[PDB]
Design a binder for these strands. Structure first.
Ligand SMILES: [Mg+2]
Ligand SMILES: [Mg+2]
Ligand SMILES: [Mg+2]
Ligand SMILES: [Mg+2]
Ligand SMILES: [Mg+2]
Ligand SMILES: [Mg+2]
Ligand SMILES: [Mg+2]
Ligand SMILES: [Mg+2]
Ligand SMILES: [Mg+2]
Ligand SMILES: [Mg+2]
Ligand SMILES: [Mg+2]
Ligand SMILES: [Mg+2]
Ligand SMILES: [Mg+2]
Ligand SMILES: [Mg+2]
Ligand SMILES: [Mg+2]
Ligand SMILES: [Mg+2]
Ligand SMILES: [Mg+2]
Ligand SMILES: [Mg+2]
Ligand SMILES: [Mg+2]
Ligand SMILES: [Mg+2]
Ligand SMILES: [Mg+2]
Ligand SMILES: [Mg+2]
Ligand SMILES: [Mg+2]
Ligand SMILES: [Zn+2]
Lengths: 114, 122, 54, 207, 119
RNA sequence: GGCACCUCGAUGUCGGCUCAUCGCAUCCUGGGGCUGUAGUCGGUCCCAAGGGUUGGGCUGUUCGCCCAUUAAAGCGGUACGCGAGCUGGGUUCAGAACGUCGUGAGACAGUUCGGUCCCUAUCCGUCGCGGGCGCAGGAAAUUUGAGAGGAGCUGUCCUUAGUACGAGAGGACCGGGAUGGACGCACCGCUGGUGUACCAGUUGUUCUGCCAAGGGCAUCGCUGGGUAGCUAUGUGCGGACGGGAUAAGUGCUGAAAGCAUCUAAGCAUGAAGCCCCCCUCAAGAUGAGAUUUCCCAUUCCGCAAGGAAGUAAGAUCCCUGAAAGAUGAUCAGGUUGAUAGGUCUGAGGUGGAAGUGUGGCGACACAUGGAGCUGACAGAUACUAAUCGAUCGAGGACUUAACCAU
């Protein structure tokens, strides 16, 4: 738990801000097609932040053209150029799984600023 | 995990609204078919117009699934609905448009004509 | 199932070569002299490891 | 060929330079020590002995003490034998450090599987069940024993019993990174055995 | 992990909550072997709660200690005795407040017996 | 179908399920000869049994038809394999109705609705796990391998090349490279599952004298998450490259028979078959092997063989446990010591404790404060328990032989 810890500490990224589940943010992903380096912006609510160490991940959910697209990343990958933070939400959870349903039904369910 | 007897919804203006799965194309097993596979399928529900009738055996490809799809660097993508496009037994679609997001494991196959008709690709 | 044939004496007492007891692990309690069993309090003297247990 | 002996410590991850995730198994080591040579004029083959992970002098008996005191070292806990190798770059007392595997190589990993206990058939041999409804009284039982005509059971049936604990060899793995300082070996994939166990990392036989 | 001791998830908690206050009021009891090996890790945690002296610690321990009378004449209680006495006594000890001594077997069912006592 | 030799002091019959194994008169994959084979596809015959050989609709169904795939959807034996392994839809008990026959009771190789499936494994057999003695002194480890088992499958695409072939249409063998299906092995870092002594919210009612704060029961009361272990649907790997003899075929020289001829002398080549290469078990392989290291100058009886007693190396009893486990067994330890527990310090999980204060009429909100709580994860620290002790365990039989010296 220590010997592994250091050899993985060698590759930790140490420039991204902190954030909890339930706050909008913007990820700049360095998607590649083979000859150019585009950058796609994918913003949404952080449904989940899981794991610890170099194996730490997190999930972002948005609603694009009706249907909702979830998308998870390893926090320390180099295919992410930066991470903005749009706003902060007030939630009582650590894993927001009730949002996967409160999308339609002619009622908008969003969080509150804190 | 699309398998026999699944009911998918059609993601373009061909004339079908839902479709049922009759067979996964592949080897002699092939219980399951994830994003970017071709399926034999029968039209259950249809619109009054359209070029596709009710009760027809058509080819189809798969664009969205609830089951995710793992990528190279260990990143995942998921949706909340299964969706399909009706192939003409040639990789061209049998419609004109596409409705919604389309996955990215398509372009790595010969399905350029479909990813070129989508609003956006995630 | 039901026994096809009865069992002789020879087999009946070959089977019982492993059905017996074992002498326990006994030692001398060096406070009184009677035999206790190892790692346990001496129920005859009431002591263990020198000190006592009223 | 070449090979060493180490201890499994547990799995982890590393990013390559492409920026892609790779499962990785860590294996620590130490300087092994050649304790004996088996030449063809004394035995029927060619083989050296390797030692590993010395143990304190109270846990060693006099035979082992005398055996390991001819290379002038300390009583080793794991003793094995690497057979197929050139036997002129090895002397008794000399060491075999972890620095013999470059990055991107291809190795094999031999280790003892971890025990599962007394398991049935559905789990040991990967069989199928009967139904769980429709009036049945059959599920999780090993099936028919065979035909009536032999009047006996054929040698080779598959029944419950003790599972795991055997010796297994995985082939065509690959070294990721070799930390020469801390005596570490990052191998891609997973390897058999419970944590804190002996693992033999030889070179590739297929080629 | 831990032992199940033949009982159920609630009968087990009831038994342990009984034996804890028994050992507290008595300073030594006697029971079977395994049932006394599973108790010297539930008693020492409550002694560690008692060595804190806070109010949060008192309310955490009250949700585990039943209500018997320790000292009948002073109208004391298991909780107050725990805190005051067994915080004054084991003040410079770091772990290991108990000890187990083995008697022989029982007579009725040949089970092994033992003694447990606060050091 | 024929016979009636066995079974009437009792063997119960068809389909389906679980598990299979064998034969070749070969469905596929491999190698060839002829062709009314230009190429791509075919036909028929020869060698070949290593592996593979599907999901549904209708019918109790075997059978059978149809849908969609597939490299292919083989034919048969094993009491038409397997009911002290399953089922009971169909076969022939007692109830009832329809058709026909009978004057009637009733009958149907006619139809339809309903209808009890018993058994604690003695012996052989199969799968695992231990005690005993043997292996010419007593122990500890590393091994060789007579022999045994496992695996054995295939698709698409790009190139060679729109070249050979062909009016055109159409379109290759041989050889290279990627990437899949089904199957097997291992593992938990990722994605998920479970997690009944983990964290939080909440309903009813009883208890801690009361308020606050909590406990008991109601399926773990219910609801949302979830550590370690165990897991697949998740991840990694595998069936590679070859060698030696062959089958059918193709042969080179060469006579019997002045020529011809694959053969009688002689010399080759030639397959997913066979023996090795790959993986596992293996000296009870009574033919009981090999290598390296420890212990040995005792004491009594016995003319002698031998017997007995204390021991040496080593082992066990007993205790603390788990990377082990039905129980033995195995593995890590037993005070010059981190084996377990406790305590500290962390990782991860939950998610902002009690008290107090401020705001509000009140339900409540904010601050102190990533707070408090924490089972099975990691590291330090002898605080508690692994006390004292006992039992077992050698003294190495003969007979020949070869080389050296007298
Ligand atoms: Mg099945
Ligand atoms: Mg026989
Ligand atoms: Mg007769
Ligand atoms: Mg007659
Ligand atoms: Mg007869
Ligand atoms: Mg009879
Ligand atoms: Mg044949
Ligand atoms: Mg239907
Ligand atoms: Mg039959
Ligand atoms: Mg027959
Ligand atoms: Mg039978
Ligand atoms: Mg009747
Ligand atoms: Mg009538
Ligand atoms: Mg009439
Ligand atoms: Mg019926
Ligand atoms: Mg039975
Ligand atoms: Mg984990
Ligand atoms: Mg009241
Ligand atoms: Mg109240
Ligand atoms: Mg009550
Ligand atoms: Mg309850
Ligand atoms: Mg729950
Ligand atoms: Mg542990
Ligand atoms: Zn005594």
């Amino acid at each position: 738990q220590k010997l592994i810890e250091d050899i993985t500490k060698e590759q930790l990224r140490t420039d991204l801000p902190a954030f909890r589940p339930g706050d909008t943010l913007r990820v700049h992903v360095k998607v590649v097609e083979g000859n150019r380096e585009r950058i796609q912006i994918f913003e949404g609510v952080v449904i989940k932040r899981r794991g610890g160490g170099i194996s730490e991940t997190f999930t972002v959910r948005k609603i694009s053209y009706g249907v909702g697209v979830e998308r998870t990343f390893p926090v320390h990958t180099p295919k992410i150029a930066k991470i903005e933070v749009v706003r902060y939400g007030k939630v009582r959870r650590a894993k927001l799984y009730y949002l996967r349903e409160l999308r339609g039904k002619a009622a908008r369910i969003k969080e509150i600023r804190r | 995990m699309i398998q026999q007897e699944t009911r998918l919804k059609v993601a373009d203006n061909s004339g079908a609204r839902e479709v049922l799965t009759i067979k996964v194309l592949g080897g002699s097993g092939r219980k399951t078919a994830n994003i970017g596979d071709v399926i034999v399928c029968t039209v259950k529900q249809a619109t009054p117009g359209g070029v596709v009738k009710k009760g027809e055996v058509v080819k189809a490809v798969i664009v969205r699934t609830k089951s995710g799809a793992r990528r190279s660097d260990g990143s995942y993508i998921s949706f909340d609905e299964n969706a399909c496009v009706i192939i003409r037994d040639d990789k061209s679609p049998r419609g004109t448009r596409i409705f919604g997001p389309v996955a990215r494991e398509l372009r790595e196959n010969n399905f350029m004509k479909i990813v070129s008709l989508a609003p956006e690709v995630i | 199932a039901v026994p096809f044939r009865r069992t002789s004496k020879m087999k009946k007492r070959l089977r019982r070569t492993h059905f017996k007891l074992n002498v326990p692990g006994m030692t001398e309690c060096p406070s009184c002299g009677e035999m206790k069993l190892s790692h346990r309090v001496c129920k005859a003297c009431g002591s263990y490891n020198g000190k006592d247990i009223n | 060929t070449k090979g060493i002996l180490g201890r499994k410590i547990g799995m982890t991850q590393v990013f390559a330079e492409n920026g892609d995730l790779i499962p990785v198994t860590v294996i620590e080591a130490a300087p092994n020590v050649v304790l004996q040579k088996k030449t063809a004029e004394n035995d029927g083959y060619e083989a050296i002995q390797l030692g590993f992970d010395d143990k304190r002098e109270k846990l060693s008996n006099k035979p082992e003490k005398g055996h390991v005191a001819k290379a002038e070292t300390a009583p080793k806990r794991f003793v094995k034998e690497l057979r197929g190798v050139e036997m002129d770059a090895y002397e008794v007392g000399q060491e075999v450090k972890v620095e013999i595997f470059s990055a991107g190589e291809i190795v094999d990993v031999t280790g003892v599987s971890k025990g599962k206990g007394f398991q049935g058939a559905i789990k040991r041999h990967g069989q199928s069940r009967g139904p769980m409804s429709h009036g049945s009284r059959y599920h999780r039982r090993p099936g028919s024993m065979g035909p009536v005509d032999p009047n006996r059971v054929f040698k080779g049936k598959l029944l419950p019993g003790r599972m795991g604990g055997e010796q297994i060899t995985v082939q065509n793995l690959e070294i990721v990174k070799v930390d020469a300082e801390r005596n570490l070996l990052l191998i891609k994939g997973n390897v058999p055995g419970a944590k804190k166990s002996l693992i033999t990392v030889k070179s590739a036989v297929k080629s | 992990s831990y032992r199940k001791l033949g009982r159920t998830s609630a009968q087990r908690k009831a038994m342990l909550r009984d034996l804890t206050t028994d050992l507290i009021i008595n300073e030594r009891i006697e029971t079977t072997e395994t049932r006394a090996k599973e108790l010297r890790s539930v008693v020492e945690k409550m002694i560690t709660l008692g060595k804190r002296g806070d109010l949060h610690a008192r309310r955490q321990a009250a949700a585990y200690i039943r209500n018997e009378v320790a000292n009948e004449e002073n109208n004391q209680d298991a909780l107050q005795k725990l805190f005051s006495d067994i915080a004054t006594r084991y003040e410079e000890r770091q772990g290991g407040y108990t000890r187990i001594m083995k008697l022989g077997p029982r007579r009725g069912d040949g089970a092994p017996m033992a003694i447990i006592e606060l050091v």
